[PDB]
Amino acid sequence: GETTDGVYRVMTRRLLGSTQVGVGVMQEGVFHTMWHVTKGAALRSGEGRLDPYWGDVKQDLVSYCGPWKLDAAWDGLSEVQLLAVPPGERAKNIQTLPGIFKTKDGDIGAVALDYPAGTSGSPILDKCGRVIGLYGNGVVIKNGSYVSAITQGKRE
Amino acid sequence: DMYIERAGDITWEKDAEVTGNSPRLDVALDESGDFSLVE
């Protein structure tokens, strides 16, 4: 059905009423989202049906209809924007300057914005308007505030 | 069964809410895709 480039809500009816479990990005006819959101399950778009194509539980990423398409990266200097799509609320761009996640395999950016679980999979944009990652997989620090990583997948 | 609904365009909005800090955290990623603090 709807293959339009843009940010989408991932919804379910298995629970009470309509519930937003996550968010995702559609680009080049491919839907990109965090793995913990769908658990690799098939999606529906009107009478159309999206099937998983690629996935990885460690990276916490999953693409539908095709391979991963998002490839822009944070330059480690500039301010980025989180395109937050909260459950039952309008999409709201929140400009922030990312932090750092020092891991044994290298550093990756981190957005320190606090949102409900149903917001997982919200794109993080650069100044041109390119998706440099997905917000939704991170850790809770000392003062209870949430810090998500800037999760990006590998293009082929 | 899950389903998708469009929510907007992917555009940078000039003059948007500038908030949030930039912390340097030492973290660890496990086989299950979960992050954890390292101290």
Ligand SMILES: CCCNC(=O)[C@H](Nc1ccc2c(c1)CNC2)c1cc(Cl)cc2[nH]ncc12
């Ligand atoms: C306690 C910090 C870790 N939790 C998260 O990152 C949450 N998502 C998430 C849940 C399950 C799995 C993963 C990720 C990956 N591996 C399985 C999560 C995201 C967001 Cl945006 C707001 C949240 N509020 N509470 C949890 C929460």
